[PDB]
Amino acid sequence: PSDREQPIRVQADSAELDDKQGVAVYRGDVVVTQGSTKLTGNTVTLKQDKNGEVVTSVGKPAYYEQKPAPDKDVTKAYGLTIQYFVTQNRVVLIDQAKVIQEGNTFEGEKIVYDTQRQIVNAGRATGSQVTSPRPRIDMVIQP
Template identity: 35%
Template sequence: MQNLNKILAFCLLCTLAGPLYSLPDDRQKPIHIESNQAERDEKGGTTVYEGNVIIKQGTILIRAEKVTVFSTTEGVSKIICKGKPAHYQQLPKMDGSMVLASGNTIEYRPALDQIQLIDNASLEQDGTIITGERIDYDVTSEVLKAKSDNTGRKRIQMLIPPTPQAKSANKETN
């Protein structure tokens, strides 16, 4: 009987702890869109939103001046956001930190969990900031690729903050 109580207690703990360690799948959440105006092309599968557009899906928040949503029979395939700049944020992991991104154009592919930041691109997470002409970011694998412009005049820049250990070591030596 005592072993049965231990097993039941363990199962109850596992059931309660599960939601604490897993982030809800943003792709499975509904997409909420607010704007000043919208136009839908049913045959073409596109909807254009204009004027202070706000998109929310789970932990994802997108702000832009103009957004075009491309749909297929399987749902939303791509979202293109335009702004000066447009902004994107998402919490990819419950125990992680917020990803903050911006670009004059943001292409978001919900099914692939990927974003492309184009023209004046910037991405920040955990104090690390990368800027460039284009940044491709895979949210699931946390892999990013950054590119400068074709002329090479606007190079990629990256800021990496010191680790907490390095900060405390610097204080001790000063």
């Protein structure tokens, strides 16, 4: 809901901003927060669009955290590469893609996450050439 009208704060060791290109890169224990949303990583790049469009994080692994309802349903997300398409409300996890929602653990080569519809897709990384091949996904629902 309100994870987008709030300001984006970034904390790192270093940053470089190309206001001409509209691209910013942050390095060193990078933490970007937007309300309840959180992205971490070794290296984070923000790309700017006409009026605001994607936050790409890379780590071992990169981490996404978010809260959909005000209740205690915090969703964790892990991936070698994570892209947060903020205009699209889409978070794509590549290469060891994991998602922990309420005891339910999700694993795959590639996981796409709609933060609005709260829809989680899991499958293979078509044309991303993963370092950890995983042609089959795993799912666990904890009782």
